[PDB]
Every structure is written in structure tokens, then in C-alpha cells.
Amino acid sequence: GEETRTEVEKKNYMNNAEEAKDVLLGVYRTNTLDAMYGYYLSILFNLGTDISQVEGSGNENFRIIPTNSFPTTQSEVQQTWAALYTGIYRANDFLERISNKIGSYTTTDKKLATLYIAEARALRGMFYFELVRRFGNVVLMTSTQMSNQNPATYVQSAPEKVYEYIEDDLLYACDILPYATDDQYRESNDYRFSKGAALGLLTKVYATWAGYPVKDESKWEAAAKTARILVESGKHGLLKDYEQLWKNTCNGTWDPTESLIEISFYSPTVSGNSDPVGRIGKWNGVKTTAIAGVRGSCAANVKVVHTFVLDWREDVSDIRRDLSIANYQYTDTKKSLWVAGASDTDESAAEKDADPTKAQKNKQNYTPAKWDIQKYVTTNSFINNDKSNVNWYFLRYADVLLLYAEALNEWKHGPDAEAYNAINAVRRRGYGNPSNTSACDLPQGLDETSFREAVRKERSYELSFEGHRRQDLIRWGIYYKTVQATAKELGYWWEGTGSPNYSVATYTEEGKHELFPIPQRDMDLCIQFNQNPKW
Numbered sequence: 001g002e003e004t005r006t007e008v009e010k011k012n013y014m015n016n017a018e019e020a021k022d023v024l025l026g027v028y029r030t031n032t033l034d035a036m037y038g039y040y041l042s043i044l045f046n047l048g049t050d051i052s053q054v055e056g057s058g059n060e061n062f063r064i065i066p067t068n069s070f071p072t073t074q075s076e077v078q079q080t081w082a083a084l085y086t087g088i089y090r091a092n093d094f095l096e097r098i099s100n101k102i103g104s105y106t107t108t109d110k111k112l113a114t115l116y117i118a119e120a121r122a123l124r125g126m127f128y129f130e131l132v133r134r135f136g137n138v139v140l141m142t143s144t145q146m147s148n149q150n151p152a153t154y155v156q157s158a159p160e161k162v163y164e165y166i167e168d169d170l171l172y173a174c175d176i177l178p179y180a181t182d183d184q185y186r187e188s189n190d191y192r193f194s195k196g197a198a199l200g201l202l203t204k205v206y207a208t209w210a211g212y213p214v215k216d217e218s219k220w221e222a223a224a225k226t227a228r229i230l231v232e233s234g235k236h237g238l239l240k241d242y243e244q245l246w247k248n249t250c251n252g253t254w255d256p257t258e259s260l261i262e263i264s265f266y267s268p269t270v271s272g273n274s275d276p277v278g279r280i281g282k283w284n285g286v287k288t289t290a291i292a293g294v295r296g297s298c299a300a301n302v303k304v305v306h307t308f309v310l311d312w313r314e315d316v317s318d319i320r321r322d323l324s325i326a327n328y329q330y331t332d333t334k335k336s337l338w339v340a341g342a343s344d345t346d347e348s349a350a351e352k353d354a355d356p357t358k359a360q361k362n363k364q365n366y367t368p369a370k371w372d373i374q375k376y377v378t379t380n381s382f383i384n385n386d387k388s389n390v391n392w393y394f395l396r397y398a399d400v401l402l403l404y405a406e407a408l409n410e411w412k413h414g415p416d417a418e419a420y421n422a423i424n425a426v427r428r429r430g431y432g433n434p435s436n437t438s439a440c441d442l443p444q445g446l447d448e449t450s451f452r453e454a455v456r457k458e459r460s461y462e463l464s465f466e467g468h469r470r471q472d473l474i475r476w477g478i479y480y481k482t483v484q485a486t487a488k489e490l491g492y493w494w495e496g497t498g499s500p501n502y503s504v505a506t507y508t509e510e511g512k513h514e515l516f517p518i519p520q521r522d523m524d525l526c527i528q529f530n531q532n533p534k535w
């Protein structure tokens with residue numbers, strides 16, 4: 001990216017908004033990296049909760065991170081740290097440069113330039129948010145010049161100061177960006193920041209800031225006030241059909257209604273060194289065999305915790321359950337249930353699948369169904385066993401509605417009408433928009449504690465496998481408690497000899513695994529750094 005261009009090359013570019021746009025798109029491109037949303041930040045670093053875990057019984061090979069059994073030297077961790085800082089460098093570079101060029105732009109281009117400034121600042125806020133929530137104690141690298149300083153000069157900032165920096169960035173994007181559907185300045189804003197995404201992300205930032213580890217409880221009110229602006233704008237909503245979200249994201253269909261922050265992956269080929277393709281629907285897909293000349297395989301290493309399945313099966317009419325979880329795989333010839341053994345007929349396999357005491361071993365192999373390529377992709381493209389053109393939802397309006405409900409309840413110490421309306425909008429859509437909502441709605445009469453429990457659960461039903469559960473458990477201060485409780489619950493369910501698979505419980509340590517370590521390579525280069533607790 002721009003980090004490899006010289007001082008002279010950079011001073012000769014960005015002479016108008018079209019040139020500036022090209023550099024801005026390079027900031028966005030950071031997101032498609034394997035170490036960003038192509039794999040690590042989307043899938044790999046979000047496993048090991050009450051809803052999902054990595055495949056297998058142990059911690060070998062790719063299972064080391066999802067089982068929390070990795071050292072400070074783990075390569076993937078260093079790669080994400082480096083990629084975030086690269087994103088930040090690109091954002092900083094763009095901002096520094098456009099500040100010096102905007103004065104020369106035409107009236108039309110100055111307007112676009114402010115939007116682009118807002119987009120870069122929103123991206124920078126997003127990158128710092130990931131850094132601060134995942135690593136805890138990070139460096140505010142505020143200029144490209146700082147990136148070239150001797151690393152003995154680097155110091156970690158208080159998380160409160162990193163949050164304030166993110167907040168300033170997102171507040172500017174909220175002020176400057178139009179809503180996606182109101183925008184008559186940009187020719188296209190597909191998969192780019194607009195006001196709804198800025199407000200939505202700022203809501204999530206404030207909610208997290210209010211939770212663990214910073215615990216600035218004043219931010220619940222800020223989260224709620226921010227979400228209110230977005231909710232009351234009437235500019236965004238929920239797609240009528242939950243399934244449409246998956247159809248859309250698997251087919252490169254941008255719809256700004258619900259999708260606020262979505263990473264687009266697309267290449268006609270995968271024979272280059274920097275093709276913007278990811279692992280979505282592959283590593284976290286439905287298990288699928290390769291068929292020569294027809295289909296690439298999907299490894300489908302993200303497995304669903306069966307106790308989550310059991311809880312969700314009680315709410316029969318919730319249509320999201322079957323749209324979210326695959327109890328099947330694709331063989332060379334058919335869609336087949338995971339529980340189907342060699343002797344099973346369709347009827348016997350169906351009976352085993354429904355009974356919690358049957359075929360328990362194979363039930364552990366269920367996967368998400370949200371990124372079922374065989375089911376959703378309508379077009380032919382490259383055949384590859386590892387990569388795809390499937391997109392990644394980082395932030396949907398439903399998440400923001402649930403955050404609004406959560407934050408209102410936290411701030412007001414109890415749910416109000418707005419909190420109920422926000423959560424019930426999500427429940428109604430999740431039940432297929434029933435004529436009578438008395439069955440799907442959360443009942444009146446809940447108090448602070450019970451509404452809190454309801455909203456925390458709804459997040460699993462609404463957003464399962466989309467990368468939020470672990471960070472939610474962490475900001476709620478219950479990550480270790482939940483891993484431990486999940487281990488017990490699987491043990492109660494399991495009726496066979498031995499134990500059910502839940503390797504993450506063997507290694508997850510309270511006071512350690514709520515953060516990733518500061519990468520050892522960086523510890524070794526920055527003499528003023530302190531490693532995170534218990535790392």
C-alpha cells in the first residue's frame with residue numbers, strides 16, 4: 001500500500017477527489033487481508049464460547065488459538081497487530097496528505113474530500129477499536145512520522161485515551177457523512193462508511209467502553225443516545241426476510257437497509273498474491289466436498305456447541321435457528337445429515353437428529369449455515385478449496401437495535417418502551433413477522449436483571465457465528481464463567497463414554513484470556529511495553 005511509496009511519489013498524487021478516492025480505497029483494502037476480516041478477525045479469533053468452537057477434541061495445529069492454548073509468540077496474533085497498525089498508517093497517511101491538498105480542490109471535490117476524511121477517520125476508529133478491545137494496552141500511533149520513530153520511544157496508552165481517540169474519529173464521521181440512502185455526492189457508497197455505520201459503530205464502542213475492562217458506566221447513556229439518533233432517523237431497518245441477509249452477503253449484493261459495515265470480497269480469480277478473497281463460507285462454511293471441475297471443498301472447521309442448539313430448539317417458531325445452524329453437510333452426491341451413519345435411512349437419521357440422547361458424537365460437527373455456498377451462491381466463479389467471494393458482516397442494524405435495548409436497560413436500570421420496541425423488532429423479524437406478536441415478543445414485566453439476560457441471549461440468536469460472542473462475553477465480564485459453565489452443560493448432555501469435545505475449557509484461564517497478548521516480537525522491540533495480565 002501507500003506505506004511502500006516514497007515522499008516524492010505521494011506529493012505527486014491526490015491532486016483531485018478522484019485521486020484521493022483511489023488512496024482512500026487502499027485504506028479500505030486493509031480489511032480484506034487474511035489477518036483482518038478474510039480470516040483472523042472474522043473467524044479465527046472469535047471461537048471458544050457458549051455457541052461455537054473449533055473442530056476436533058484437542059488443541060493441535062489450527063486449534064491452538066480457538067482453544068486458548070497459544071503462546072505470546074503465536075504468529076497470527078503478531079500478524080493482526082501488524083495489519084491493524086498498517087491500516088492506521090494508511091489512514092494517517094491519507095489524512096495528512098488530503099489536509100495539504102483539499103485547499104486546491106474544486107468546490108465539488110472539497111465536499112467529496114470531507115466525506116473521504118470522514119471515511120478514513122471511521123476506518124481508523126474501527127482499527128483502534130479492534131486493537132483496544134482485543135489487546136487492551138496499545139500504542140496511539142498518531143502519525144506516519146511516529147511509525148518511523150525508534151521503538152524505544154513507544155508507550156502504551158491508557159485504554160480510556162484510546163477510546164477517546166476512537167470517539168473523536170467516529171463523532172467526526174457521524175457529523176460529516178450522509179446516510180447511505182441520502183447520498184447524492186458519492187457515485188457509489190456500496191461497502192463504504194456512511195452515517196448509519198458511523199453511528200452504529202460508535203454505539204458499540206460506547207457499550208464496550210462501559211463494560212469490562214474499562215467500565216466507564218457513563219458510556220451506557222452515550223451508547224443509548226447515539227443509537228437513538230440512528231433508530232429515530234428512519235434511514236435504516238431490518239430486511240423483511242432473515243434469509244435474505246445470507247443470500248445477499250453470499251452473492252455480493254449490497255443493500256444499505258440493514259448492512260452497515262460489510263467487508264466485500266471479490267475476485268474472478270485466485271492466482272495472484274493479493275487477490276481480495278476471503279475464507280468466509282470456507283473455513284466457517286458448511287462441510288462440503290470438492291467435485292473436480294464443479295466445486296471447491298469447504299473445510300468447515302467452525303463447529304456449533306450442541307447445548308446452544310438444544311436451548312434454541314425450545315423456541316420452535318424462531319426461523320433464525322435453521323437459517324443459522326447446519327445439521328448437514330454436502331457429499332459428492334447429496335445433502336446429508338451429520339448424524340447419518342452407514343446404516344441409516346433418511347427417516348432413521350431424522351429421528352436420531354431430533355433426539356438429544358442420540359448420535360451425540362456427530363452432532364458436535366454441526367456448522368454455521370449462514371455462509372452455505374452450495375445453498376446461496378447463484379453464480380460460477382473460481383473453484384478453490386480455501387477462498388471465496390463471500391462477504392463479511394461486521395455490523396448490521398439488528399446488532400445496533402439490540403445494543404440500544406441493552407444500553408437503555410443499563411442506563412435506566414430497567415427496560416422502557418424504546419428498549420422493548422428495539423428488541424421486539426428483532427424478535428418479530430426472527431419469527432418471520434408473525435401477524436400475532438404475543439408469541440414472539442419479549443413479555444412486559446421484565447426487570448433490569450431479566451431484561452439483561454434476555455438481551456444477552458437475543459444476541460446469540462440474532463448474531464450467532466458473526467464474530468461478536470466472545471467479545472460480548474468479555475465486555476460483560478463473564479468469558480471465563482461462560483466457558484466453565486458451557487463445559488458443565490455439555491457434560492450433563494453427554495451420555496456416552498468419555499467426554500464431549502470442549503477443548504477450550506482445558507486451557508482458558510481467568511484473568512488471562514480476556515485479552516490477547518501483546519505480540520512477543522513487539523515486546524522484544526519496545527523496551528517500555530508491559531505484557532498483558534498473566535501473559
Ligand SMILES: [Cl-]
Pocket residue numbers: 021186187188
Ligand atoms: Cl466516491
Ligand SMILES: [Cl-]
Pocket residue numbers: 046052463464465466467468469470
Ligand atoms: Cl460468534
Ligand code: NA
Pocket residue numbers: 250251252264265266389390391
Ligand atoms: Na463478494
Ligand code: NA
Pocket residue numbers: 491492493494495
Ligand atoms: Na452426562
